[PDB]
Design a binder for this molecule. Structure first.
Ligand SMILES: [Mg+2]
Ligand SMILES: [Mg+2]
Length: 326
RNA sequence: GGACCUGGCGGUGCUUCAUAUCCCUCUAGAGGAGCCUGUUCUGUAAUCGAUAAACCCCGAUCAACCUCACCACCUCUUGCUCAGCCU
């Protein structure tokens, strides 16, 4: 039973980490060019060019960002394996945020690159369709000890009930760290929350630049397409402990990933609970190494907020440049 | 009829101070978030109940298709060992 400090935990990012220049610093590393070639073969366009140099507005579109993040995450895993083989050898857990979950399974030997990427493509397209279906959006909110989230959601619904719309949606969509949440639903609700922050005791409020209300019932139309896409795919037993976003626990048997991966589409993301499940321990016990295989450093900040002692042994795989030309 | 005595109130309050423990003041930290437990109401035919008996092979852990426990149907019979149960 290895001492905590030798083992490693891989964290895969999700929506919102896209950035122009993604992939440079990973191409010359082994087996990455072939991965982008397979991405071309499956998608139908050149992901490599878009990630390397793109207008950032095409890259911000839902149909493109998710496959880009998936491919970049797996390329970063390849680079980390090249630099530090022991880190990949001694892996105890894996977790992804929204679409990075699909990456984690592929890293865990539960899926393959082609099938996983096809699933991600169908997911992104279906979500975009549902986003045009009804106007919707996402809002990140940081609260105080006096802040009531469900309560604020209730009046956020009361306003647009007074306006008049069918079963208005405004619910907490992402649990990411203490007192910081992301609420999802109609624009008028989130607009109401912005201007009643002071009443609702919100320190900060920031609209997420996303197309629609992810992880809510508004994305119900996108469940059935993705559902079909996962039937042909044969998921195996994950080799490492992969943690889910619906209920924030390990995937225990392969016969339930099929339905959890579709329930995630319309269920809040339990990221705080996943961090607690992976890192919570008695004071004085050591923590594992943590590697954010993928673009950005957001999960690093979220881990810093969630658990400082775990964050002390955190590092990120850089996907925008490389120190040595391999 | 006269004189005297004991008393008893398991009694009643107040006064002053010793009045330390206990106070009161005074000093220094302990509410939000996520999980797990206690109680209540509601609900089920039924137990969101337990692992000298699973899983895991960082810590812990939830339900695990482990297994025991509960509910609804059945089967076995002199059987394991003049058996068997932690009742
Ligand atoms: Mg039970
Ligand atoms: Mg028994």
């Amino acid at each position: 039973r290895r001492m905590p400090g030798q083992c490693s935990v891989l964290l895969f990012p999700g929506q919102g980490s896209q950035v122009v220049g993604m992939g440079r610093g990973l191409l010359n590393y082994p087996r990455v060019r072939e991965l982008y070639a397979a991405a071309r073969r499956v998608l139908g366009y050149d992901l490599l060019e878009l990630s390397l140099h793109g207008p950032q507005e095409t890259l911000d579109r839902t149909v493109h960002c998710q496959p880009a993040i998936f491919v970049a995450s797996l390329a970063a895993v390849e680079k980390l394996h090249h630099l530090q083989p022991s880190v990949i050898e001694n892996c105890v857990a894996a977790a992804g945020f929204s679409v990075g979950e699909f990456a984690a399974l592929v890293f865990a030997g539960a899926m393959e690159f082609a099938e996983g990427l096809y699933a991600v493509k169908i997911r992104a397209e279906a979500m975009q369709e549902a986003s045009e279906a009804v106007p919707s959006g996402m809002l990140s909110v940081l609260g105080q000890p006096q802040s009531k989230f469900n309560f604020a959601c209730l009046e956020a619904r009361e306003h647009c009930k007074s306006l008049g719309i069918e079963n208005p949606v405004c619910e907490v969509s992402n649990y990411l760290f203490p007192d910081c949440r992301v609420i999802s639903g109609h624009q008028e609700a989130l607009r109401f929350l912005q201007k009643n922050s002071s009443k609702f005791h919100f320190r900060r409020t920031r609209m997420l630049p996303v197309s629609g209300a992810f992880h809510t019932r508004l994305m119900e139309p996108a469940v059935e397409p993705l559902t079909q896409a996962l039937k042909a795919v044969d998921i195996k037993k994950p080799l490492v402990s992969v943690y889910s976003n619906v209920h924030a626990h390990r995937y225990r048997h392969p016969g339930h990933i099929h339905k959890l991966l579709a329930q995630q589409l319309v269920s809040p993301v339990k990221w705080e609970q996943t961090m607690h499940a992976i890192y919570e321990r008695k004071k004085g016990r050591g923590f594992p190494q943590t590697f954010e295989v993928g673009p950005g450093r957001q999960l690093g900040a979220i881990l810093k907020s969630c658990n400082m002692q775990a964050w002390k042994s955190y590092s990120a795989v850089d996907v925008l440049q490389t120190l040595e030309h391999v």
